[PDB]
Amino acid sequence: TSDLIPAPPLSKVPLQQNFQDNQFQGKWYVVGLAGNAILREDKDPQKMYATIYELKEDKSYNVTSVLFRKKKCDYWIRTFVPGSQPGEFTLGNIKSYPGLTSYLVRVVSTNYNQHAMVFFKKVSQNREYFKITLYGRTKELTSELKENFIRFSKSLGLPENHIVFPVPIDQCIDG
Ligand SMILES: O=C(NCCN(CCNC(=O)c1cccc(=O)n1O)CCNC(=O)c1cccc(=O)n1O)c1cccc(O)c1O
Ligand SMILES: [Fe+3]
Ligand code: NA
Ligand code: NA
Ligand code: NA
Ligand code: NA
Numbered sequence: 179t180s181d182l183i184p185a186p187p188l189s190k191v192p193l194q195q196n197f198q199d200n201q202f203q204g205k206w207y208v209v210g211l212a213g214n215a216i217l218r219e220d221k222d223p224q225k226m227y228a229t230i231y232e233l234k235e236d237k238s239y240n241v242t243s244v245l246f247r248k249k250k251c252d253y254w255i256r257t258f259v260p261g262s263q264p265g266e267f268t269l270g271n272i273k274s275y276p277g278l279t280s281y282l283v284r285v286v287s288t289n290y291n292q293h294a295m296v297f298f299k300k301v302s303q304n305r306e307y308f309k310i311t312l313y314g315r316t317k318e319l320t321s322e323l324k325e326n327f328i329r330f331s332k333s334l335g336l337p338e339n340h341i342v343f344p345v346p347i348d349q350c351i352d353g
Pocket of ligand 1: 215216243245254256299300302
């Protein structure tokens with residue numbers, strides 16, 4: 179009833195050295211999206227969405243994703259609590275998500291003011307999902323950065339049809 183490309187070993191997922199949590203704050207556009215549950219679709223292409231990171235006093239992120247769906251703005255809210263090392267996080271209040279037993283975030287690379295690559299691994303209803311997101315501070319990034327994202331996604335076992343580049347939009351994500 180479900181087939182998934184296996185999640186890579188964490189050894190294949192680099193960590194951004196000297197992660198600066200204050201500089202990673204603010205709005206990021208999802209210009210690239212890859213994962214074992216991500217599928218390319220050409221009848222209904224994925225629309226670009228935005229994810230806003232806000233550091234609280236206790237140094238956990240409030241993470242709000244803003245999606246344009248059904249002619250309305252949908253808000254997906256979660257909390258990233260600092261993990262085993264800087265640039266790694268786990269999900270706050272995992273009990274609120276039914277079936278979710280694990281959720282790991284790892285910032286693979288970033289220059290903070292233009293681009294980032296972030297790796298996610300979650301175990302939900304015993305199934306191990308993973309995704310990589312190419313974050314852009316703007317809605318567009320260079321071909322070099324996008325090709326690097328594709329290369330990295332492929333290095334984690336993902337084929338091309340599991341790698342998408344959401345189409346830029348103006349609704350919801352510009353506020
Ligand atoms: O199980 C969850 N969601 C399932 C619903 N969708 C599948 C997510 N697909 C992934 O490939 C997947 C794999 C690994 C980690 C991960 O987070 N995600 O999403 C679709 C709806 N998505 C959103 O509503 C959505 C919109 C914007 C950002 C976002 O993360 N999500 O999930 C889930 C639970 C807790 C926290 C999350 O961030 C989740 O995505
Ligand atoms: Fe998610
Ligand atoms: Na299913
Ligand atoms: Na949460
Ligand atoms: Na966890
Ligand atoms: Na391929």
